[PDB]
Symmetry: C5
Subunit: 118 residues, 5 copies
């Protein structure tokens, strides 16, 4: 299996977006977070973030932001891959979450979506 691709939520929509700049530790950072819904429900893990100078995978900040904003704009069904309990800044996690955004793929029906499944 593809490392860090075993945790995901399928057929969700990105219905909120946060983008901001923020100092954490000794690093000046950028971050964004997606807020998730699944139809009228709010999924268990519903806030996922990516930070430019922190994380399991620091590459792809701009591309991941553009991708998320695009799906925010369309409101289409997606699968979000993420990694839990990454962020150590307790102020950041309380306001948002500890989840790191790993990947986003598109969905054509219930439980297909592009990408690896368990």
């Amino acid at each position: 299996n593809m490392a860090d691709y075993n945790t995901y939520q399928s057929n969700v929509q990105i219905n909120n977006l946060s983008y901001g700049v923020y100092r954490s530790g000794d690093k000046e950072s950028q971050f964004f977070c997606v807020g998730l819904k699944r139809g009228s429900q709010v999924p268990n893990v519903h806030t996922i973030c990516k930070i430019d100078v922190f994380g399991t995978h620091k590459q792809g900040f701009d591309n991941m932001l553009a991708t998320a904003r695009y799906y925010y704009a369309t409101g289409e069904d997606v699968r979000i891959y993420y990694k839990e309990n990454v962020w150590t800044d307790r102020n950041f996690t309380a306001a948002f979450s500890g989840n790191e955004l790993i990947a986003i793929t598109t969905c054509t029906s219930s439980d297909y979506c592009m990408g690896p499944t368990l």
Copy 2:
């Protein structure tokens, strides 16, 4: 609390946009500013700016600009996080404001915008 996230206006719309180049002191800079409305109302702080080579957070000029431009285009409800009394160039503050743009988040209703609240 997340430092610099304690000051914000919720459920506003970005109804004006400025982008320009400008020399301040001896430094060549870029800046943009968002102008705010709240329905027919004008919020306490209504002009917020970001500058590429100045400010409490220099990172993220391009992403913040594209993000602001997007919300200007849709005119949707957003929350604006900002920092007061930042800019020391009195020519700039008189023309725009002393406010530095920190973050922009989306709103799902008149009771929910993404991000930390007081």
Copy 3:
């Protein structure tokens, strides 16, 4: 003939998209994959990927991504040029494919897409 331009699918549509970050071997990478259809049909080779730090051609990651995203949005008829059996990470190829994305061109009719043909 143009090297790497001898394998392609004409008049297909991009109907799915994946973007992600991933450690492959000893490298931190970004990737995306397009999923292809031909009307209601799914061609035998239907998944094509590009990776920023791996492949026969590492250049053009951002531009190819933006290009792929535009055509996903319009859903218009395109020709996809690709190279088979490139990726050696069996975790990746099993979840996605071994195909490398080389070029995308638009189509004017059922008989004509821009670019070189066999």
Copy 4:
């Protein structure tokens, strides 16, 4: 007042756009120009340009281009700040103009545009 912000036209529209590459003297450059209208009229100064490797302010080429292209698309009322008779290449000024683009801001009415005013 903000240096280089004393010359502008309020409530004009960008109704034409030029982007190109060009060798000027011994330098390889990019440039773009906006062409202006004011309703059904053409203002006295109606062509304003920005060049990547020349000018009073070389910074912000890509951001200014994107900014201008957006207003070209919306055709909305803007205020254009510019500096006259900057470019010295007479082939260029004859084809386009000698004006350097400094800033673009939006207008809510014929009595309000964002930015410093006289």
Copy 5:
């Protein structure tokens, strides 16, 4: 006159787009090409290309691509400035053309496009 601005097609439409990666000599390159129509007719010169690491003007690849994609999206009347017989890769010219894209400008009517004329 502006060197390399003496050859152009006025009031054409970009009706096709090619983007790709390709090795030429010892250079890994990106290229794109626009395909041109003039209403229902196909103009004498109908394929014009720009290559990131080759040409009379290597600068402005991303910006020229963005510009071309924009006019492809709108299908609007443009003027294309180009240079003939530039590419020496005969496999490339056979697939596309020997034409280098120099500039693209907009047209407000059937007798006016922005930029210098003969």
